[PDB]
Amino acid sequence: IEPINFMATMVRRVQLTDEDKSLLAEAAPWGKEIAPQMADTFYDYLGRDEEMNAILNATEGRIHRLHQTFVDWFYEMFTGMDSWGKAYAERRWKIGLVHVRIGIGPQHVVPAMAVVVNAVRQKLREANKSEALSDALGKICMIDLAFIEQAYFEVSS
Ligand code: HEM
């Protein structure tokens, strides 16, 4: 309802610390480096699902937009935009409403998010990044997923 307030509840409930935020903000340049490959993995994953591939069929110009929206969203987890504040919360809430409007649900987004976290965890291990960075990214992916699921709850109901 009030994005900034939902954000404070989500950072407390997922236990995302000042330390986590520092690890994310420090890894941001690396996040920016891997984002395009993450976008490609995600696109291919969605493409292999009959139901989710049907949903991704508005136009071809959609491919660029689907790649770019993903790259910016992914990088933003590392920077937090306004340090995981009001603008972050408003952007995450708008992301939630977009998915509810196109008729995608928990059966799509919860697994999709499991695949993102799995794919990022592979990149982290490839690059021999810290386990503390890996935990922090797990936390912020799950904040973002709560925003999407909460939007679906509020727009449904
Ligand atoms: C962790 C999961 C996901 C994330 C983080 C994500 C992220 C995004 C973002 C940032 C946007 C742009 C929203 C905007 O306009 O402001 C978006 C749009 C979209 N997403 Fe997702 N998404 C996810 C899952 C999915 C899934 C499972 C589908 C299934 C097909 C999907 C289909 C779309 C479509 C069709 C759009 C609109 C693109 C357009 O404007 O033409 N997304 N998503």
Side-chain angles (χ1 to χ4, degrees), residues 2-32 34-156:
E2 42 296 306
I4 183 43
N5 293 320
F6 193 67
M7 192 54 193
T9 306
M10 294 298 96
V11 339
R12 180 180 58 72
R13 281 185 185 150
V14 169
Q15 301 186 141
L16 178 84
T17 68
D18 281 349
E19 155 81 328
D20 294 332
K21 282 173 180 194
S22 154
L23 295 163
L24 291 165
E26 185 187 38
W30 183 73
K32 187 198 219 83
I34 77 177
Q37 173 184 351
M38 298 287 303
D40 286 333
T41 306
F42 196 50
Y43 186 85
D44 293 343
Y45 156 80
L46 296 179
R48 294 188 304 263
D49 184 281
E50 267 193 30
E51 190 174 51
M52 304 192 285
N53 196 46
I55 289 145
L56 289 189
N57 69 356
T59 310
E60 53 86 3
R62 210 180 219 181
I63 288 72
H64 163 71
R65 151 142 276 264
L66 292 184
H67 281 264
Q68 185 56 40
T69 56
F70 186 97
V71 155
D72 294 340
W73 159 80
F74 180 82
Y75 176 52
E76 282 161 1
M77 287 199 289
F78 293 79
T79 71
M81 290 167 69
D82 60 346
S83 189
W84 297 275
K86 184 169 185 270
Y88 188 91
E90 293 186 348
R91 182 49 190 159
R92 265 58 188 163
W93 182 254
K94 181 54 168 303
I95 293 169
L97 298 176
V98 161
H99 291 92
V100 196
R101 288 167 178 153
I102 79 203
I104 94 154
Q107 74 159 290
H108 311 113
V109 173
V110 174
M113 190 61 81
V115 167
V116 169
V117 173
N118 190 254
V120 63
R121 288 222 203 270
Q122 255 100 102
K123 295 297 310 178
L124 283 155
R125 278 199 286 263
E126 265 171 53
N128 184 232
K129 297 282 195 186
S130 77
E131 281 153 344
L133 177 55
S134 180
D135 294 344
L137 263 160
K139 288 179 190 187
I140 189 62
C141 288
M142 293 298 281
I143 295 174
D144 279 31
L145 173 63
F147 266 90
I148 292 163
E149 296 296 290
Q150 187 65 36
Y152 192 96
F153 155 79
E154 308 264 324
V155 174
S156 320

